[PDB]
Amino acid sequence: EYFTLQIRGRERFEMFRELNEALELKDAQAG
Amino acid sequence: EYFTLQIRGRERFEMFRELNEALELKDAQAG
Amino acid sequence: EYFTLQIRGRERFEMFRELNEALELKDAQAG
Amino acid sequence: EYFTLQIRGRERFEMFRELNEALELKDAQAG
């Protein structure tokens, strides 16, 4: 049930944040 | 500065989880 | 602008393959 | 074993380039 991941690095977070965002978009076009 | 990012993806999270642990190891060598 | 990247990891490649297709999708929606 | 992945992005490539180099380093620690 969900997995919280704390990232101390601001850059690293931005990366995963971009992947998480693009991942959610794929779901919209992949049910 | 830590950042909590909740993700509902076992694979997606596993990715960032490996990228976070891999990025921390590189710091030990880098400067 | 192209950069041929050769890797001996079927798993690692599969990852970037998903990230590549996910990046093109998010880029198409944005501008 | 090899998998040539043609990338058409300087940023995207830089990402996989860091993930590829970071993955190879893990092999030295884990095996």
From Swiss-Prot, chains A, B, C, D:
Changing residue 3 to V: In a sporadic cancer; somatic mutation. Deacetylation by SIRT2 impairs its ability to induce transcription activation in a AKT-dependent manner. Changing residue 19 to R: In a sporadic cancer; somatic mutation. Changing residue 29 to E: In a sporadic cancer; somatic mutation. The modification Symmetric dimethylarginine is found at residues 10, 12. Changing residue 12 to H: In LFS; germline mutation and in sporadic cancers; somatic mutation; impaired ability to tetramerize and undergo liquid-liquid phase separation. Changing residue 28 to T: In a sporadic cancer; somatic mutation. Ubiquitous. Isoforms are expressed in a wide range of normal tissues but in a tissue-dependent manner. Isoform 2 is expressed in most normal tissues but is not detected in brain, lung, prostate, muscle, fetal brain, spinal cord and fetal liver. Isoform 3 is expressed in most normal tissues but is not detected in lung, spleen, testis, fetal brain, spinal cord and fetal liver. Isoform 7 is expressed in most normal tissues but is not detected in prostate, uterus, skeletal muscle and breast. Isoform 8 is detected only in colon, bone marrow, testis, fetal brain and intestine. Transmembrane segments: none annotated. Changing residue 29 to R: In sporadic cancers; somatic mutation. Changing residue 9 to W: In a sporadic cancer; somatic mutation. A motif (Nuclear export signal) lies at residues 14-25. Changing residue 12 to L: In sporadic cancers; somatic mutation. Changing residue 27 to H: In a sporadic cancer; somatic mutation. It is found in: Cytoplasm; Nucleus; Nucleus, PML body; Endoplasmic reticulum. The modification Omega-N-methylarginine is found at residue 8. There is a cross-link at residue 26 (Glycyl lysine isopeptide (Lys-Gly) (interchain with G-Cter in ubiquitin)). Coiled coil: none annotated. Changing residue 23 to F: In a sporadic cancer; somatic mutation. It is linked to TP53 is found in increased amounts in a wide variety of transformed cells. TP53 is frequently mutated or inactivated in about 60% of cancers. TP53 defects are found in Barrett metaplasia a condition in which the normally stratified squamous epithelium of the lower esophagus is replaced by a metaplastic columnar epithelium. The condition develops as a complication in approximately 10% of patients with chronic gastroesophageal reflux disease and predisposes to the development of esophageal adenocarcinoma. Belongs to the p53 family. Multifunctional transcription factor that induces cell cycle arrest, DNA repair or apoptosis upon binding to its target DNA sequence. Acts as a tumor suppressor in many tumor types; induces growth arrest or apoptosis depending on the physiological circumstances and cell type. Negatively regulates cell division by controlling expression of a set of genes required for this process. One of the activated genes is an inhibitor of cyclin-dependent kinases. Apoptosis induction seems to be mediated either by stimulation of BAX and FAS antigen expression, or by repression of Bcl-2 expression. Forms homodimers and homotetramers. Binds DNA as a homotetramer. Interacts with AXIN1. Probably part of a complex consisting of TP53, HIPK2 and AXIN1. Interacts with histone acetyltransferases EP300 and methyltransferases HRMT1L2 and CARM1, and recruits them to promoters. Interacts (via C-terminus) with TAF1; when TAF1 is part of the TFIID complex. Interacts with ING4; this interaction may be indirect. Found in a complex with CABLES1 and TP73. Interacts with HIPK1, HIPK2, and TP53INP1. Interacts with WWOX. May interact with HCV core protein. Interacts with USP7 and SYVN1. (Microbial infection) Interacts with cancer-associated/HPV E6 viral proteins leading to ubiquitination and degradation of TP53 giving a possible model for cell growth regulation. This complex formation requires an additional factor, E6-AP, which stably associates with TP53 in the presence of E6. This is Cellular tumor antigen p53. The lineage of its organism: Eukaryota, Metazoa, Chordata, Craniata, Vertebrata. The chain holds residues 326 to 356 of 393 of the full protein.
